[PDB]
Structures are given as C-alpha cells and as structure tokens.
Point group: D2
Chain length 494, copies 4
Amino acid sequence: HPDISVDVLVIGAGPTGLGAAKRLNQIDGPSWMIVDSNETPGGLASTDVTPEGFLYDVGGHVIFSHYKYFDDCLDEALPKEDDWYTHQRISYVRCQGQWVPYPFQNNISMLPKEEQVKCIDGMIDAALEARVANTKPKTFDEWIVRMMGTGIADLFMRPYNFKVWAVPTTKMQCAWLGERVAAPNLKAVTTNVILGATFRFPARGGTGGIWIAVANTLPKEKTRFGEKGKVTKVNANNKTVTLQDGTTIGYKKLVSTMAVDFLAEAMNDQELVGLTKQLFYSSTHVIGVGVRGSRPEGDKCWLYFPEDNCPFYRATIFSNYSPYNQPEASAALPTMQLADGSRPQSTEAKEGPYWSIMLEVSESSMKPVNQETILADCIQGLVNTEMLKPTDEIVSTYHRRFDHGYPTPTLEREGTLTQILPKLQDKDIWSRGRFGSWRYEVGNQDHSFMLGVEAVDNIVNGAVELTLNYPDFVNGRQNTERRLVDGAQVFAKS
Amino acid sequence: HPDISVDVLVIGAGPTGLGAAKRLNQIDGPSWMIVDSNETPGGLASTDVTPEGFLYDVGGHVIFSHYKYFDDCLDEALPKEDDWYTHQRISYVRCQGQWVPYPFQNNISMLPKEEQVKCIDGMIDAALEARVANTKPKTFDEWIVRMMGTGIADLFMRPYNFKVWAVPTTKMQCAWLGERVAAPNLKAVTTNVILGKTAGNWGPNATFRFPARGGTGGIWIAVANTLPKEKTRFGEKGKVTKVNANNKTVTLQDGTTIGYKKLVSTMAVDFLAEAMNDQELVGLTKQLFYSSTHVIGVGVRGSRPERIGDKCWLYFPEDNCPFYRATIFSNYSPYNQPEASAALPTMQLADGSRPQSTEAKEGPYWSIMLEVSESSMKPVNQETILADCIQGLVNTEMLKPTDEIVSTYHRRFDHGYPTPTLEREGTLTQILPKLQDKDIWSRGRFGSWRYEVGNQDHSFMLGVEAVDNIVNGAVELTLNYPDFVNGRQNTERRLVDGAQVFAK
Amino acid sequence: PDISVDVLVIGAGPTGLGAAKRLNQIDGPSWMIVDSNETPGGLASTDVTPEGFLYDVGGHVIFSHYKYFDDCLDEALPKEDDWYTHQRISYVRCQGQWVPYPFQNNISMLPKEEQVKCIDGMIDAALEARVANTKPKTFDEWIVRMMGTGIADLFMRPYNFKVWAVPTTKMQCAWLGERVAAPNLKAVTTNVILGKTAGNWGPNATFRFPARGGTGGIWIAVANTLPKEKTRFGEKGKVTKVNANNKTVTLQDGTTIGYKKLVSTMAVDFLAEAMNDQELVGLTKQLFYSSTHVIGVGVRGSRPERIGDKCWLYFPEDNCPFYRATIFSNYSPYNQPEASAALPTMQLADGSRPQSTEAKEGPYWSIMLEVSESSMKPVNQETILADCIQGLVNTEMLKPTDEIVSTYHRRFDHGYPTPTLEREGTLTQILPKLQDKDIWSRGRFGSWRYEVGNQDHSFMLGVEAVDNIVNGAVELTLNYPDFVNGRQNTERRLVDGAQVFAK
Amino acid sequence: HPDISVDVLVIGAGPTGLGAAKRLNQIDGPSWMIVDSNETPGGLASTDVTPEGFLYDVGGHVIFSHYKYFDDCLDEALPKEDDWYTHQRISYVRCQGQWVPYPFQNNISMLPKEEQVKCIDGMIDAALEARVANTKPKTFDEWIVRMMGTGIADLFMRPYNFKVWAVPTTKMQCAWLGERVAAPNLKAVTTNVILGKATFRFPARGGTGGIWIAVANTLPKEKTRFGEKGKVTKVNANNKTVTLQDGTTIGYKKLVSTMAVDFLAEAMNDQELVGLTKQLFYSSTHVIGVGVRGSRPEGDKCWLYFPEDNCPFYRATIFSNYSPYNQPEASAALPTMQLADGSRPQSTEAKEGPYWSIMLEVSESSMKPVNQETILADCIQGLVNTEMLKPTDEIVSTYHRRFDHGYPTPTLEREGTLTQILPKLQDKDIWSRGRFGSWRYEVGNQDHSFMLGVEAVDNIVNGAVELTLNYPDFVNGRQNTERRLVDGAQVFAK
Ligand SMILES: Cc1cc2nc3c(=O)[nH]c(=O)nc-3n(C[C@H](O)[C@H](O)[C@H](O)COP(=O)(O)OP(=O)(O)OC[C@H]3O[C@@H](n4cnc5c(N)ncnc54)[C@H](O)[C@@H]3O)c2cc1C
C-alpha cells in the first residue's frame, strides 16, 4: 500500500498533460493527480524572461485553434477582453532580398521574371504528371515536388525543411502533411503571376501565461509541481511511479506526457529503450535579441528562411505581438553590442523604446551546432537578412537549447511507433504528447492539449482518440461537440 | 408543470431507440424514459409468426457488426452459446438459369462464352477509363459502370437496383456506398474466366450469427429486458401524438405529458414533422423519397432440396419474379419453422393447383422469405403480389410446380427504404439542423433517413452516439461519417467503460 | 482528228506549266499545252490598275518544298536583280494591337484579365492532351486542342470563318498535317511572364518575290522557256468539249485534239460539264467552294511608320470584311508607280472628296485585301470596295485623311476549294472515275485539295502527274501532302541523269 | 581510257543488283553493265543442292510482295501457271509441346490455363500503361514489352529474338518494326482466350534461286559478266574506275554497289570508311538441310519458330511441302546415312523413297558462339526434341553451309553509323544498296532488296525518290502500283 493512490496519474504539465488534467477535473469522476518536475506549468510552451526584461516564448504560439474545447479552456483561463491582442494570421518567406507572402507559390510574382519562368515550367511538369498519377507520394520530397514542382521546391520547401528537420526531405514521410492530393493548382499560381483570418495572443506573460492561467483553475491539492514532482522510476507491472523525494504513487491508469524515450528509461525496460532509440529528433536553439529603437518599417508574424545566409529557419518580431513582451520605453538599458559585433562607444544606459526578435536554430546528429558561436552567427544572419542594420543597438540576448525540440517525421517513425505505443497501451499507459507520442503533426499546442483531453476521454468515457490516430479527420472539421461544460455537468447540478 | 419530467426522452424502441436507452442506462447519470406505441420492443426489427408456426423477419440483410459496443449489448442479452447459430455468408445472383456465386463479376464464367466476351470487353473499357479518371461519379449508375463496365452492369447491378430502390440508378447518389474508388479489378475477373473458376466471398472466416429462437426480434426483446422496467412505457399508453418543440413537451394518446430537456426521436422524421404541427418541416420532409416494402413468407413441406442447399440470401435482377431478394429463412435456425412431427395441411401447390389431400401430414418444413419494393415509379398490386411471388419461385426454380405450400405470409411496410436520391442531402441538411436547434436528436433509419446507417448495428449506434453527444460531448460519427466508422475497428466504446469501473 | 499528241495539258497555270516543264524536260512523248487565256499563269497572274498599281490574287507568299520548283524559277528569272528577299513578317489584328504571329506566343499584348482566360484555357488543353487517345475529327476540334477555348475564340475560330465562309465545325482537319493537336503551354506562359513579343521570322525565315510583273511575272518567264509551237494560248486554246471515250478534246475554233493521256488542270466541275457526263456533274456539284474578292488600294505618301516592314496581316475581328491584308508595296518597289508619277486623289479614306482634283506626285504605297463569299456568308458586290476602305480606317491601317489614288476589285468565282468534312468522300469517287478514262485531273481545282493548291504544290502536281504518266513515279504531293512537306525534296531536278547521259 | 566504259556499273547480281539491272535495261537509256563473282545469279537468294538431290534455299522465300514492279519481273521470268505453286501464308510457334498459330498472342489458349493467366495479366499491365504513354519505345525489348506485356514477351518474342539476332533485345533499336503504335490489342487476345478459338507463290522448279536465274535470263547477255571474270578487287572512287580479278578495268559514271558495304570499304582502300563499317554489327547464319525417307508426317507449307532452348535453330521449314521438285522422286534409291537419334542404320543398301526435307537456320555472333563441329548433330537432335523427327526416321541427305554475313543487325548504333557511311559514298557517286549494301534488315528481304536496286537506278536516271531505302514504313503501308515493267515511257517510244 504505497504513499498515494489515484485512478489516473498524469505525468507532465505541458499542454498535453494540462489537457488531461482539465478533462479529469471536469468529469470529476475518477481520482487523479498531475506531477511535473518544473515548478511552473506549461512545459515547453512556457515563457522565459531575460534579466533585462525581454520575454521569449520557448514553444511558439497557436495561429489557429481546431477545437471549441481548447477555446473554452483558454476563455476560462483568460476571460477579459484585454487579456488578449488580436493579429492577422500571416507569414513571409525571405527569398532573394524579398519578403514573399504566404503561401510562397501564390506570390512568386515578387521574384525576378526569369525565376518565375523556372517556377512555372516546373509546376507545368508537375501538373502534367499529376494528371496521370495513380500512386500516392511515399516521401516528403516526392510530396513537395508533386505539389510545387522542381523550381518552387528548390527555392523554398526543400532547403527550408532541411534547416528545420536536419534530415533531407527524401528521408521523411509525408502522411503527416494531410490527405490533400499532391498536385498543383497551376491556374492559381499563373493567374497571380500574370495579374501581379486572425489569431489571439496573450497581452501579458507571453504564451506560457495561458498555461499558468489554465493550470490555476485546477484544484491545487491534486497537483504536485517542482522538484517534489520529478518522476524517477516507473514500475509498469506494479502500477507504481516513484518520485525523486521517494514518494510512491500507485495508479490504475497512467497518462504519460514525458518523452517516450525518457519513459522507457524510467521503466528500466530495455526492450522499449532499444525501440525508442530508433526514433529520430532534433534539438532546438531559441535565440532572443532585444533591440533599441522602433520596429523596422512590420506585422505580427513568423518569417521563414530557406537561404543559407543565416543559421535560423524561422524568426519573429516578438515585440509586435504585445507591448508587454519587452520593457517600456522609459526603462534605461545600456547597449550590449552592435548588430555588426562591435562593442558600443558608451557604457551609458539610454532609454528605449525597444523591440524584440526571436530565432530558432535546429541541431541533430546530422547537423551539429557550435554552441559557443551560434548566438553571434544568428545576429550576423539578422544583418545579412536585413532584419538588423549593422548599427542597431542590442540591449539583451537570450539563448537556450532544448534537447528534445522537434520529433522528426522520418520514414521509420510509424514503423517504430506501432511497436512502442501498443506495448505501453497493454501496460495501461497512455503515452501521449509532442514527445509522449512523437507525432509532430499533432505536436502544436491545440492538438497536444486535446491529446490529453481525448486520452482521459478514452479512459473514462470510451471515446475514440481521434487526434492521436486521425489528425486529418480532426483538422478537416469544426470540432464543436466536446465542451468544457457537457450535458453531463448540466444534468448533475440539479 | 407536466405529468412526467426526464432529462433525455427517447421516442421509439427500435434498435436506434434501444441504443439510446442502453447507453442512458449504462451512464446512469441523467434521468430518462423510453416510449413506444408498440407493446413489443424492436420496432421494424421484430419477428412475425404465421398461424401455422413460421417465423418471418422484416428483411434479408443479416447482421454484421462494426462496433464492439453492439457486440457487448448482444452478448449481454443472449449470453449462452446455444442462443445463437453461426453460418457462412452465402449468397448468389440468379442470372440466366444459373445461381452465380457472389460477387457476380468474379463468377461470370458460368454464363455463355459470348456473354463473357461482352462483359470482359466492358470491364476493359472501364479499367482504361479508370486509369485516366479525374472525377468522382456523381450518380449511383455512374458508380456501377465505372466499377463493372457496361456488360456486367446490365446483367446485375443496374436491373437489380431498380427492383430494390424502385427508382433508376441514374436518379440516386453514390456517396452512401463509400469512398472506395470506382474502378474494376480486371485481373481478378479475367483470371476466374480463364481458369473457368467459380468462387464466393464466404469461407470459415466470413460468418454471421443469427438468434436461435424468435428470429431477429428476439435479440431486441432480450436487449430491452436488460433495461429497468420502471423506466419504460410501451404499448397504447406510450403512443406519442403531440411534440411541443418550443415547450419541450410530448403528449401521449392517453393524455400523459412528458417534459424533456433533450429529445432523441427515432420515429420517421416526416411523422415527427406532422406531430410538431410545423408546416415548414412538413413541407421539407415531404420532399424526401421512400419506397414501401412487401415481405412475403412461404412455408414448404419436405426436407430441404439440394438445389437450395446451404444458401442464405439470393439476388434477383431478372424480370421473371417480382422480388429482388429471397432468403432461405429455414437455414438460419431450426426454430424458425415447426418441427418435423408437426402436422399441417397443404394449402396449395407451387403452380396454384389444389392439393390431392386436405388432411394434415407431418413435415419436415423449410421456409423462404421474399422482398418486393413499391413506389410511384414501380407500383405493386397488393391483391396479387403473393401469387406472383409464388409464381416467381417456380420461374426461378426455387420451387418445383409440385412443391407443397403449408403457410403464406404477407405484410406491407409503408416506410421500407429511405431512398438515397440525388436530392436527399440537400433536403436533409435543411431538416436536421432545424431539429437540432430545437434540442431534438432525430436519429434512425427514418429518424435521420440515411439508408447507409439504417440497418441494425448502425442504427443501434445512432442512438448510442446521440446520447453520448448529449451527455459526454462525443462526436456523432456514424451519423455524419459512415465511411469512417465502417473502415475501422470500433473498440473504444464498450458496455463497461472506465467511468463505471471507477465508481464501484 | 485535227492534231494528235501523246499527252495533252489543259490549262497553263502553275499546275499545267509544271506538267509542261517536265514533259519538255523528259522530251520523249509528244505534247501540247492549251489555255483559254492568252497570258500564262492562270489565277496566279497579276493585274494592273489604270493608275499603275499591280495586284496579285493572293497574300500567301511562296515557300518552296521542292528543289525542282527552285530550278524552274531560277531558269525563268536567273539574275539576282530579278528577285527581292524579305523576312516572313505577319501580325494578327486584335483589339487595337498588331499581335506578332504566332498569336498564342504574343498574348502579352492583350489585357491581363484576357491573358488569364487564355492561359486557363490552354492549361485545360495541355492536361487533356496528356491523356488524349483520339485524333481530332473536325478543324474546330483541332484548333481547340491546340489553343484552348480562349485563344481559339480570339483568333483561329473567328478568322477561319472569314477565310473559308463556313464554320470550323464543318471542316475536316487532316489537311493541316499529322502534327499532334496539343499546346506548347511552356512557350505560351513563358512569353506572358516575360512580357515578351516574338514573331516567327528572322534572317533565315524568308521568301523571295519577283521584282517585276508581280507573281504572274514568274509564270510568264517560266512559260517562255517552252517551245512556242507546242503551246496554244488565247481564244484559239479554249476547250469546249472533252470526249473521254474517244480521247478527243474540241476547242472553240473547232480544232480537234486527240490525246493518249490527259492532264486536266481546269476546275473539275467545269471538266465534268465539258465531258457531258451527268454522273460526274452530280458528284462535282457536291464539292463546296467559296468565291474570293480581291480589293487593291493605292495610297499617296511615304510608307507609314505604323505599317513598317509588315507583309501579311490577319483580321479575325468583325470591324472589316477582309480576312487578310498585304502591304504589297513592301514586296517590290515596281509594284506601284515611282515617286515622280503624278496621279489625282480619287477619295480620302473616310470617303470624302479631295481638296484638289490636280495630279500630285507620290511616293505611293499599296494595300491588297482578300474577302471571301459563299452561300453561308454573302458579299454585297456593289459596296464591298467601300466597306473594305472603311475597314482600313477601323483597323488603323489608314488615317481618315489618307489619299487614295487607285482602287482595284476583281471577284474570282472559284477562290478556295473548301476542306469540308464531305470533301474526301466525294473526291474519292471522282478521281478514280477520271483516272479510269486516262485523265489526270490535277491542280488547285483540278484535284480540289486546298493544302496542295498554292504555287509550289500545284506546280509539282503537274510535274508528278507527267512523271507518273511517263516514268511510273508516285504522285506523292497529290496523295501524301504530309510526306512531301516534312522532307527535303531534292531528288527531282531540272537536269536529271537521263538528260545528262543523252547529251 | 580504261578497258570498258559504262554510265552505270552494277556490282552484284543478287536480287538488288538484278533489280538495278532490270530497271536500267527497261529504261534503255544510259549504258550499263552488271558484274558478279559467282557464275550463277541470285546471290544469297540462290538454291543449293546436295549430292543426293535435295534442294535448299539459302535466303528463304518471299511470302508477300509489296510492289507491282516486283510482280511484273517474276511474271516475266516465270510466265506459265505451272512454273509456280500457291500455298497459304501461315506460320507456327513451337511452345511447350504445341504448334501455336501465328500471331502467337492470338492463340495462347493452347497453353496451360495458369500460363494464360500470366500472359493476360502482363498484357493488362501493358494495356494500362499504353493508355498514358507519351513516349516512343527506344529499344526492341521496350517495344516487345509495351506490345505484348512481360508474360508473352518471355514465352516467345524475347528468347526467340536472341536466337535469331544473337544479341539481346535490349541492344537493338525498334524503328525497323514499323510505326504501328506499341500497344496490345487486349480485347482480341482475351476474346480468343475466352472463346477457346492470304497466299504466296513458290517456284515449281529450281527453288527460290530459280526465280533469279530466270530473271537474270531476261538481261542482254553481253551486258553481264558473272563468275571469276567479274570478281571486283579494286574500286578507285576518285578515278571512277573498278578493277576486276582478271585485271579488267571498268570505268563508270555512277556505281550501284550491292556487295557488303564493309567489303566495299576494303576494296576502296579507304581507312575512314573501313573504320566506320567495322562499327556495324552482323550475325552469321548456318543453313542446315536434312533429307528424310518416308511420307510427310502429320503438313502446312510454312515456317516454324522455336523460342525454346531444346533446339539450336530459330526457325525451321518442311521445305519438301513447297514443291515436289525440291527433293528426289520416290523411285530414286538412296542409302540411309544415319538415323535421327544418331545411330548407324541396320542396312547399308540403297532403298526407294518417298522423301521429305527439313531446313533449319542457326545464328552465330561474337556474343553467341557456335560449335561448328557439332552444330549439324545438335540440329538433328533438336529436330528429335521438337518431335519433327522420330528417333527412328532415316536421314538420307544432310546439308550444312555457313554464311559469314547472314543478318545485318538492327543495333541501337546502326543508324548513327549508317548516316555517316551512306552520305560519304553518295558524295563519291556510289549507291551502296541492299541487305548488306545498305545494312537495313527491314528492307533486306527479296522484294525490298530488288526494289532498292530499281529505285537507286530510278534515282540516278529519273530523279525518283528512294522510298524503300529511307521510308520502309511508307512503302510497306501502301499498294505500290505506279512503277511497272512497262511504263508510259516505253509505250510512247514504239
Ligand atoms: C483567289 C485565289 C487566291 C490565291 N492566292 C494564292 C496565294 O496567296 N499564294 C499562292 O501560292 N497561291 C495562291 N493561289 C493559287 C495559285 O494561283 C496556284 O498556283 C494556282 O492557281 C493553282 O494551280 P492551277 O494551275 O490549277 O491554277 P489555275 O489558275 O486554275 O489554272 C487553270 C488554267 O486553265 C485554264 N482553263 C480553265 N478552263 C479552261 C477551258 N475550258 N479551256 C481552256 N483553258 C481552260 C484557266 O484559264 C487557267 O489559266 C490563289 C488562287 C486563287 C483562286
């Protein structure tokens, strides 16, 4: 008879685990507890702050929500209108001196006329092949070429995805992209050549403020965050998890949102360790740069970088998302360096206003990253891409490296996962999440939050885990049926 | 305030309604009651019996379950191994004097060689067209021709489906058939022709189970028994006459008023519109097309003839018999007809003539069930259909002229098939959201009018998922994504979920 | 009978002169060539206005498929100053623009919204071509498969109706060649993206045109090389009866000519009437043809910068009755009077009277128009000249103020033999019947096949007919136009081995 | 001033040269002479006879004539109805104990059912690919597969053509087969499977070589020079002078050379042409004749094809069916030389007949050597293996001759080489034409070859297009009725 006993134990309090917790706390049936080694909920969707006052999200922001359930939980956490800012859902690709709007292929009119020809010629090839295709694409690279043609593949999606995933497009599967047939809309691309939706963001606290607020709604006594909640052993057969302080938790069902390879190690289950080690992943460097001045003459989006004049694959003007992402203009800060690398003339603390850039650089066994120099190379890439002038004054830098950044959709991934996840299922273990179940396409915040919700919904109410197994299905519909108040709660308060 | 008040009211105790009730009784959260105008549970899945002792179900589509939850409800209702019999899925198409194993195209080797050429030539055209196809078929007929080619479509699926739906294949949609691409397996069809082979899509893995006693209606009697009796109201006392959508009240024949917070109505949606005195819905429901179905049962004296054998359902595209499908109902269970020692007089011979003797002789007996469909595009003479069917049994060589008939059965069901017309979804996407906005889950074979989810396992789950949506926010998968549920193993919803284990 | 020869040739247009050049080369069997016209060249002749302006019957310049044709022209006009060389410069007049030919490669000149419609149609065409497994059955189908709907509607469809005076749906398409009917989508979209214009001419895309006499000067020169005594042109050479069974032709003056083989280049419907063969007449009357109006306009002034080096122009739009126009004054400076020649202005292009009736000097330039007429598309003979001149103002070829000093209008009853769907069905009944009576009916209207009806093909029709009559040669041009067009026909020369070995 | 002077000199009196001679003699214009090293005209279309009285053609027989001109010359040469026999145009393929009528694919119902399945399945694959084909086949093997599919290719056309050409189907071009699109008639092949379901004339006497002796009789004797007196040893292209073995020098104005073009290059001492001709590939051919005692075994007057590898020959014919004058009459007495199984006969005595006769062809090349010392025996064994001879049949005559230049190989390289050779010879006023004069097998049978010489003369004199040489597809697809042995030119001269 161990130290604590619960029906469902939730390991991890990132969006996946908090999803499971929100649903367990709504159903309010089986007993439950959620643990996390971090004192602050949010996992990799947390927000850091530099000593100089600049916020940087670790794990991006949602630009589209697929579930009314997710929406209800956000509204509960942040219910006032000035808890949120609304911006347009846009993005750009940096290509040959130009900021090319999304979607790239629909905007190549911005590139030189000679290069437009190369693109259309490639897409005509693709359109003609698609017309007699009778097989589905087998690799990511095949999917790209069949969709965009050689010309448009080489300018953007091919070189870009190598910088993101640190594997060639030929070594990745493509089912994760959807069931949309891989063929081009040739008429759309040429018509635009010839002729020449919002998201909400937290006003305060960055993205990680959402998850603090969502977690606040949980009963504190059913949570255990910090060093007291680090899981060190998992005894699958005794249904016992052991914590670092020696506390033992017994469960009837386990929702594990830690990385499945870490789970395999904590089970001292060498069969699973062997299998998990077959999974490929890339590590992520998040770099933040705080700059003195006003914003460069734009809007609140992500920027993509296929070219090899900067080490990062994506950048954002994080200061455009919210004015509380960086210090107020009256705050005094010394200039740390110039964008060109030189030391400033004066050690004087001057006022702002300030703006802020965030970068991501990926690292893997096939793509090393010089930890000692990457910050400077990024800042240089910011000068090369004309995001920073050589003379801009940098007042804050941020650089953190996350070992498990992206779960890589390799060709082998599904083969390995259908050996890992059913084995854990048979031991009554729902290993779910960005790295709990290792599927990038459902690894952003709304899908992940719902992986936890649906996992609990499967454990209690016999629901199909739709997001886990049918991302295509959930992405192609309005998910309105599951709500933070279902009929069950309405009929019980009578 | 009204006479009775419940959270979820279920109108109708056919499989859909029993599904809704089975899940309400499992969850055991919100209060509920289920009503029906018939004293016997099962709706149109009931079983009739002739005065002579022959059982007849309402149709010849046996049960195939897509859901572990359906299995659990059956296993609970009839748990002993000898409550069920297991048979192989054996069916044939009757074509040009031959019983052609199903699927038809895999067995055209039984037809004349000149006809084999026309069939293969048609399927070659279809395969070549399939190779450069870039559109979906828009009509049921296009789907058939793309699947089989002209020759094979004309021998079976075209003439047969007219006899089934009583509308032409060109006036029906085809999404209800699935997302499988409409293309032929030319190599399979030519290979069997070359080898001269026949082969059916059955074998020991391809089975179905049938209730040992009571026919199909016995399943639903057993399922309904598992409900708490006090939460039911069946018979004349449970006939619904008014449904006041805005006051959320249903009124019964005897004047009892039931107040509901949410309503699961499994009656035919056109009658529901009448019972709401809602002239907008009545106009819309009157746009829905449906066919009426005649069930004919014929009881025959003798041991089972070799020409019949272990056959189960039979398909009839040709115009020498009024029925589209026949069933050897006596093969499904020995309790579907009287025992051999039972004595019965011969009523007539298959050719219509009087029997030599009016005295009752012993059996054994066997039993055939026929289905005939009727519509404004294909009328049916109620006064003669029984005799024309019996003649059709002779024309198709199911009965010899001298076979002795000891029992006949004929019932006509006004709402038989909800027709998958081209117009159906356009009308249905106007009707269902309106009923949903009034908190009405109109579900079922005619509650939601979608044939492809209107047999027993789908319909049972329509009610289960409708409740699951009302209480637990589950997606109504069977209602809106039939292709999705049919193409997967639905093992997650079970009659004992975590919720019930954690409460005990 | 009065005269007897082995091979008689009726007509001295290009086909018959071809027959004669080869008969005169072989110099074996006896022969004579007759024509009702005193001037050789038939309908490839050249007219001249009283004011000194030359006008040909057409706007299709000469492109030779045969070294043999080349040898015969060179013999007739051998000095370098007998010919002028120009680049093949042509445009389509469409929506205020002179669009370089080929039309589809230049739609960048049209409004963008219209470019989108054209490219969208051609994408549809390219994708259908990718899975096509039938040949086009009609001219219209061939156009659409080549261009898509948009580009077909802007040019080839409306234009060919003005040309043939029947719809593109009523015409066959085998005569255009065996080139598969599919679009060059990359070429068309590349030019749209680049904003490029590009015509199908250059330094080596040329044609040569006679310095003097117009086109009809070639055939005068060619005919001169024949033995005069073996020709009989004028009223003395009009054929009125043809007795196929006695192999006798009767002339207007009553001379009876007996032949062993006959090469007839008169219109086959006229031949059938002249044979008093009611079976052939019935069949020939099944053949469709359009009549062609030629209008010539002589203009005062130096060549306008807007006209430039243009040669032929195509007119699909319905603001002018003509389908084609030619800057005939660019082909040769001797096609119109010299600058010192004085001519009064007859009218202004807008129809108004000139200020002065006095004769002023030039220089001059010259336009030739072609308008077609048929039972499905009539032509008001009394007004077509004015309507043409109005069409010159509408198409911005003439300013309202331009001074017209000469006009020409002639109407040729047999203008184009129409490639109808019915043509081969009827022709494969006519030609074998005439062949069985030893009659080689050949030519633009002798054999009625438009695609071998311009000057080089017709010339060779007569050459090959003689070569078939004498040497067993295959009549390749007659029955396999595609074959001769796709190759260099270098084997037959004006001096073969036979003539080298005999001298 | 050389020994003789002619306008057109014709080297060779096989069918091509005789064609050249017949037309020159018809035109009767330029002077001319024809020479041949053999005293008997006919070249490799000649007929040999064994000491025992059995005739064997070397170079087969024409089964279809494409030209009324060819017909006119045969009718002139052999004008009586009893100079010819008429037989039906048919052939069979020997495949797995069966004689499968031509065309093979239309008769696969004779094979075991499972093999019909493999054939139809392969042809279904070809039918579906042809539906989206947009390229022409580049190799013979590609042409076969696209036409017949894998199953039927492997049973007949693939192994058979290796035995014929003695090079693989992958190393040969396919333009020589015609311009008929390479696609299967799937309905015809399956219809015959489901249902279970045109003459030539042959010389009465002298075998095929009698045609050419008779044709050669029509030339003026003084204008011919056959035998050792007419062997050409030197060809001086620049002096337009040919020198013979007896030292006679012939001056020409135009030269029609029908000897093998590689031999022509040697005789010109032209190392540029020698190098070029040596690039051309050819196979050597063994003709084997077997004379048998007995009546004909249970019969049609055709060729038999042998794709299987239980006999070394690729085709065989019952030559005794073509004419009773191809073998001795029954009253002639001949000893048995051997039995078909190889053993010595019981009796050495000369017995009466009747007799019948088999002819075989075996191909040899650098890629497929042949044992000269055993090939006759191996052939006789192959006749037993294919049940054409019973082990006990009595063989009374054997014939074995090897022709070094047998077939000009339609290799992938051939047209590249030929368009370097034929223009060089054309520029020296040399019309090199024929089976080996111009090396194009598809016009190397008797009627095409005869016309190559006719058309070459017709080009030299009358400016006619050499249609057969350059456009085999064109002439094969039409009735060539225009050129006749009496043209208008001769009619108008009398
Ligand atoms: C309107 C028109 C426009 C053309 N435009 C072009 C062009 O742009 N480019 C081009 O290359 N070609 C053009 N041609 C065709 C060109 O002229 C041909 O080379 C030629 O006309 C066709 O050859 P032919 O010899 O059959 O022609 P024809 O000129 O028809 O020759 C027939 C001759 O026979 C004579 N004849 C007829 N009946 C009798 C009789 N009963 N007795 C005696 N003699 C008789 C005629 O008078 C005439 O001289 C055009 C033709 C026409 C009609």
